[PDB]
Design a protein around this ligand. Structure first.
Ligand code: HDD
Ligand code: HDD
Lengths: 726, 726, 308, 83, 84
């Protein structure tokens, strides 16, 4: 026995808040959570307790500490098969990472629709509010490698595998409603431009480099998604607090055969929330695994990520009713024109057991659709359909990737396909072809029909010559970036300006900066001058006179495009740093934690060393981390209770803790003598909005702090932050 | 597009003789034949009847006859994901074939020992006569690709995977008791010499080419296995009628730690039997699948292949007591010096379901040993231990090849190895390393001991310098070839001479033929002269004066080396051709079939066309094949009943059928007027041993034929076949 | 033409200080820097200026901005071989990264001895001070993936390929003089312990986690290299300012057959220098490519990395 | 991609074109060609957009598909004319 | 033998290099969630050098036992008590 006698090596198999226990494989943490897909993985799960250590051939190993050698200081012998199998497996552990979205974090969950959608689609998973569909969801960045950092400025992926009774449907989306480019043929150009540059393979996880901005400057279709990426959308607080979109117009097909155009949405039920740039950049250093960690810990705590599936629905006859093309993936459909109809709820409630086996090996592909859905001619979607089956042949080793446990359908699957590398299924059918007589033609084709039918494509009219041509309807680049900009609050606009300004400063070749500034002048003059100014560029008279693009179908703005315009804050699952001292006023701490607990807000008790401190009334307080060990970057608010403030008052780290948090616009709360810390962040004697302060922590100190947290950040603090060296 | 109303598309799930029913996957043909390994494959067996045809993602297909196109004469669309999944899978069906032994045929079965061997080995699978171990066995040729012919002149592989309670043991043997080379370092040189030559990739499945004979002439260590290859052992009648040998000396280790040296043997319970060269060569054209077919059909018939496992055991103290080195794999241990002790019986009783999944992807490796077994320093075995794990990484796509269902242990396996391409096992262990405290160090090492213990190598003394040097004790090359020669019957000797003469006549560079005849002069002068004469070479006086090598430990012969010197005939599962006429004498056919059935000998009814003929009494006889369609090469004997002999008397193919059978030394039986065919094969009225004749096919007639079949071929006819033009 | 009129898109082909010019492929930045290995690569270098855009089969592309479709708003056609080749190649760009030392930064150079070592070794590359051996050197971290940060606390690798007249010699070392473990059979255990933990694949580029310290605490043979990694050794300022070591005792063998035991060292002529912990950790956020950048830029500037 | 081990099979000597080939494709297993182009994307300014597209014409022009008319619905249907 | 080389390394460092080693161990072990593992590491450091073990322990809020305070230092390396 190497485990400690008191069993403190083993995490409690029950919901616990972040930091309270070591994290664990999901079937060990939450054995009682189940769904149809998790149950079907049981045949491949492997335990370990009480079992002998063996080779992969099942031979028990006696000594797993040494190679076989001729004498104990002698050469290793080639007959050591136990050494060579173990080292061989190790030597071949890695598989190619994903060409894009290589960095991602995934969980199991389930989906249920609120009502039957049979009037508009025959898709089985949408047919019955009692039909629950297991899901597996992987969230991701786009540019960096699998070992790159989470809190980068980049697009995020949001991919969902629905294990339906009529097939696997993969909804493979991002966290912005459009993409950078119009035609798939340009994907390798765009992706090579955003990716690390080919001579030296720099930079990682960063769009702030010459070739990305060179491409954007020469390809104005990109500017719409670039606006999104430059906004705080580019730096989400959590995968739980970002939107999801399918981007493309797809089709729903009902039992009557009627097609309805659809764009897919996910609404975060925890609301929309993003970091600020300095915070996000510094956090890639302090915890490059912050989003992966935050997702895994929310699930372990029972703060399950929840999202509402929604559809924008457009009748076939309205294809041409808008100022933009519905097939153009650089255009969004404003919610003011086509509202999102609520469809159902998805809940992510179990982490994987093994990240490699379930996460790294998962394969999602937007061509995996089911009867009741169909494609359109969106020419970016069209090329995606080729890519995702192709790339799996090298990434996952061959054509049997659907036999990798995580990818397997839970519904039946039978066909005449055979062999291929690492083939698992052993087919007993006398036939491997159809039509056949020798097995009475089984498995048999199935006509389309209202339920449980064969897939038939919708019989859309195609007419035109065989051309490599962009639709002229796609050749408008500025009106949607304009609507997005005007839809943003003044502080969100400032953060956009600052994003372009900081990015363009990292472009070495000045002409590229100038060319991007000229593009911005076609979108909005105010945006363009504020960036120019930060770059020491002066707009020409011509640039000053560019007519702005037209509004979109009469819209001067759409507040659904803003993260913060319409508050939708939710404190459940956020986290507060509590800065302790060597003799804490216990009644402050009791009141703080009681109020935090009642709203499902977590806490971490920080000090200058690890171990414990003892409160005024003798309560022993366990310390979670040091000030420097768990920086304010990782929390949503900071609360400092009273006690022996002199203990920490000239602590550099404790002071810097409040300064970093103040700079990043977080709520700060100070009780009794902790009020001395006002001097470090220069708060006036009478205080300012966003700093909570009182003689003690009541009733009403905590309601004010929790009200600030519901609003996420203290935007009104922004003009004050430049003053502080932090 | 469906099954005939009568059900005649589906084979009866009962034992049936060859040709009576179409062949089928094992689980459909013999569903009640089970064993622990066959049952464990049930998680991956996939049925078909009554199921809907789907994509691999489980989407039902409506029309599997057409691509998606823009108009029914229009271009195929990229969005056709059904077409592309089906074509992608097809396009990636193939995997690399085995470097050597690419052509092979396999079956499932079981082994059990006759008595516990715990005095000499602690191997669990040899510990209890009533503990059954499942096996999977693959037989093979060596040189040709997976689509080469079966009845080539070559060595055969005989590989058995034993799925024991203490791990997989693979006994990876051949059908001759030695190999061509001494040290693994030369294996690529030898294999490249035997394989098709690199400029033009000719010849396939044949050693009769310059590079092979060049290597042989320059490496006299090869001569021993060359002698076996040139004898009729090179051309077995069936995988059921050849010996198997592990070749190397291994170790058995008992519970007290005592090492006994051991060489493994398989004895065919159906007896030893080989083709003759003309027959074997013509059969690679008439049925390149003859051995694969005959094995599969024997198992379908209930003629299960049975082999007795045997060990030659040599105490440690006797390592150096022979005139050859025990660790030299070009030397055999004569049974007159060390007898084979019977150990147990293996029965193969079920065919696979899918050849690719189970046969092509099986991985055997002689380093897969279990506690109670161990290696020796045999320098050919030593390098084999590196090769078999290495080759599987490309062949089977990575280090998870033991998860491919055929290769899986049925005993437990648990360890800290992770990931790799197409990883199936989902490990729940918090730990992926040991020592660990986080999982209390599970799975754990296990000390060695009497049963269920960890594997520890026998602590052999090693003393010597690091050298690349061949042991001087291996430097003797002629005495075993000679023992082999002198142990053959006169007709087996003739066939060796004929094999060398035919082979060297195909070597284009005459000096290589000359150098080979010089080698033979160092083995036996009579052999060397008989080969030389066929090559128009004349031995020099010096060659004529080469002193014969020494006897092997006083042996001038060992009859266990001959296929035929000691009768071990067994007619069950052999097959006779019965040449029909349009008015068969039913009384003859009745007596033939009754006597064949009593001894388990099968029949094929042959005619000049397909369909039916009707016998004298009304019996409708279905015709299995035409005379040309199932030549005499494919049977063991020929019977011609009486009737309307005029119908077939001047038929060229019926006459040639008897000529080819006569040439190939097969028994022929002629009843009644069928005796008119004696003229085609020049037999005197008084008759000839090997030709059964009478007025009718009675009791005595069939006994005589059956006795001849038990002796396999009619060697005494050899002098009489040079005459006949066939 | 898309380049700026003034030609400011192209860096000068002369040494220039960090940040003075955009960085460039080495044969474009320094075309007259040669050695036998760089010259031998000329058969596979491919240029680009003034050449037509083609498929991999050599067919000239007319429109590299669009897929082939039936109508300019129509579906994409299967017969678009230009699109499928370009997307197939993209789809298959990645290869597995190294199991360990996946993060690394490499440069070409040359080695020359100070004197003949023939009294102690017959290695042809050490036989004569006028013998110039091209090298390719890759410096690396150990734990993190190829997209991980540079200024982590970790061991660094220091691998040199010597293209000798009598074969490739790779001297595959680290920047500390010992390793964590004694016997190869335990390397997958140690590596799995230091690598991201298997349930949730955290943490990246960091030894600060339970399984690493669990293993250390149970395997005292680790403590020596753990001391090195806990020191500022674990956070070099630059690959130019750290030592290298072969770690193992090897043998030199001379023409007489006499064997001398040897351990190999590389001594940085720029001296030894490391960051401090707070600076290194923050630097993984502000510039996770700091060491890769600074190696590339030192070479561009003529601050050639030199080691004895 | 499986038979020949990846997307660089055109670099296997027998398959190599004898005419020029240049583009923006990079990497893949077994990559032989060492591209020196600053750019691995188009459009680019950093290499003046080289290598460049080429209009179709009588000789040495870019590939352009014949503008066949396509007219029909999306169907998985055999033409009656094939029956 | 596991402690004498760690010790030789420790004693060859400047006083600021030693402070940085103590800091590195303290930070690292603060991130170890299972406290018994931190304690077992401190036990190991007490086999190398008492000053190092105490300074790391102080930062983790661990107190050395009497036993730990009495572990004899490992021997010098061939008579060396440092190498600069
Ligand atoms: C023609 C190529 C192509 C184009 C135009 C796109 N993608 Fe993509 N994407 C891929 C080719 C690709 C891929 C190469 O096939 C990936 C990488 C490896 C894989 O399995 O799929 C992929 C990965 C990938 C992932 C990660 C899936 C996972 O977690 O494994 C997401 C969420 C997306 N994509 C989403 C999108 C969206 C929302 C797009 C535009 C609306 C889009 N991609 C355009
Ligand atoms: C070091 C090289 C090497 C040497 C010296 C040998 N072999 Fe081997 N053998 C292989 C390397 C190999 C291999 C390359 O590893 C194969 C091919 C693919 C595979 O799985 O194993 C193989 C296949 C193979 C098979 C086919 C098993 C199957 O059906 O899949 C048999 C029966 C043998 N060998 C038997 C032997 C015997 C009895 C040998 C000597 C007495 C021998 N081999 C020497």
């Amino acid at each position: 026995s190497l485990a400690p006698e008191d069993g403190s090596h083993r995490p409690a198999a029950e919901p616990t808040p972040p930091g309270a226990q070591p994290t664990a494989p999901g079937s060990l943490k939450a054995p009682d959570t189940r769904n149809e897909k998790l149950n079907s993985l049981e045949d491949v799960r492997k335990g370990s307790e009480n079992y002998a250590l063996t080779t992969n051939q099942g031979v028990r190993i006696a000594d797993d500490q040494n190679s076989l050698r001729a004498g104990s200081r002698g050469p290793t012998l080639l007959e050591d098969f136990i050494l060579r199998e173990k080292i061989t497996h190790f030597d071949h552990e890695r598989i190619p990472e994903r060409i894009v979205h290589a960095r991602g974090s995934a969980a199991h969950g389930y989906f249920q629709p609120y009502k039957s959608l049979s009037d508009i689609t025959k898709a089985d998973f949408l047919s019955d509010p009692n039909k629950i569909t297991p899901v597996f969801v992987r969230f991701s960045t786009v540019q960096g490698g699998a070992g790159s950092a989470d809190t980068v400025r980049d697009i995020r992926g949001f991919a969902t595998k629905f294990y339906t009774e009529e097939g696997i449907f993969d909804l493979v989306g991002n966290n912005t409603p459009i993409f950078f480019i119009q035609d798939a043929h340009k994907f390798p150009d765009f992706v090579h431009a955003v990716k690390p540059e080919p001579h030296w393979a720099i930079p990682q996880g960063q769009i702030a480099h010459d070739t990305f901005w060179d491409y954007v400057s020469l390809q104005p279709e990109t500017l719409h998604n670039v606006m999104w990426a430059m906004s705080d959308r580019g730096i989400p607080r959590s995968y739980r607090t970002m939107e999801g979109f399918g981007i493309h117009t797809f089709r729903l097909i009902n039992a009557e055969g009627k097609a309805t155009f659809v764009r897919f949405h996910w609404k975060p039920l925890a609301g929309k929330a993003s970091l600020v740039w300095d915070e996000a950049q510094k956090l890639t250093g302090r915890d490059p695994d912050f989003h992966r960690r935050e997702l895994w810990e929310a699930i372990e705590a029972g703060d399950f990520p929840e999202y509402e599936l929604g559809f924008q629905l457009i009748p076939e006859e309205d294809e041409f009713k808008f100022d933009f093309d519905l097939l153009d993936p650089t255009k969004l459909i404003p919610e003011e024109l086509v509202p999102v109809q609520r469809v159902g709820k998805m809940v992510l409630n179990r982490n994987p057991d093994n990240f490699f086996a379930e996460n790294e090996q998962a394969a999602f592909h937007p061509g995996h659709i089911v009867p009741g859905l169909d494609f359109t001619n969106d020419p970016l979607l069209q090329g995606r359909l080729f890519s995702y089956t192709d790339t799996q042949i090298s990434r996952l080793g061959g054509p049997n990737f659907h036999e990798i446990p995580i990818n397997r359908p839970t519904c039946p699957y039978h066909n005449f396909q055979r062999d291929g590398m690492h083939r698992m299924g052993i087919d007993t059918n006398p036939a491997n072809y159809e039509p056949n007589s020798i097995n009475d033609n089984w498995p048999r084709e199935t006509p389309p029909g209202p339920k449980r039918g064969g897939f038939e494509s919708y019989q859309e009219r195609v007419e035109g010559n065989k051309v490599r041509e962009r639709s002229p309807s796609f050749g408008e680049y500025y009106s949607h970036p304009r609507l997005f900009w005007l839809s943003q609050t003044p502080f969100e606009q400032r953060h956009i300006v600052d994003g372009f300004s900081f990015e363009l400063s990292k472009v070495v070749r000045p002409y590229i900066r100038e060319r991007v500034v000229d593009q911005l002048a076609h979108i909005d003059l105010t945006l363009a001058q504020a960036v120019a100014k930060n770059l020491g560029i002066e707009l020409t008279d011509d640039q000053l006179n560019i007519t702005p693009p037209p509004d979109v179908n009469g819209l001067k703005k759409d507040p659904s495009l803003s993260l913060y315009a319409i508050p939708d804050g939710d404190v459940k699952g956020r986290v507060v740093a509590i800065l302790l001292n060597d003799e804490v006023r216990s009644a402050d701490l009791l009141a703080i934690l009681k109020a935090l607990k009642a709203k499902g807000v977590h806490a971490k008790l920080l000090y200058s060393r690890m171990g414990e401190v003892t409160a005024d009334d003798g309560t022993v307080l366990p310390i979670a981390a040091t000030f420097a060990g768990a920086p304010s970057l990782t929390v949503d608010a900071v609360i400092v209770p009273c006690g022996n403030i002199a203990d920490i008052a000239d602590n550099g780290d404790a002071n810097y803790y409040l300064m970093e948090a103040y700079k990043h616009l977080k709520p700060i709360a100070l009780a009794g003598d902790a009020r001395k810390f006002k001097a470090t962040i220069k708060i006036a004697d009478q205080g300012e909005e966003g700093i909570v302060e009182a003689d003690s922590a009541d009733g009403s100190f905590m309601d004010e702090l929790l009200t600030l947290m519901a609003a996420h950040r203290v935007w009104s603090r922004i003009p004050k932050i430049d003053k502080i060296p932090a």
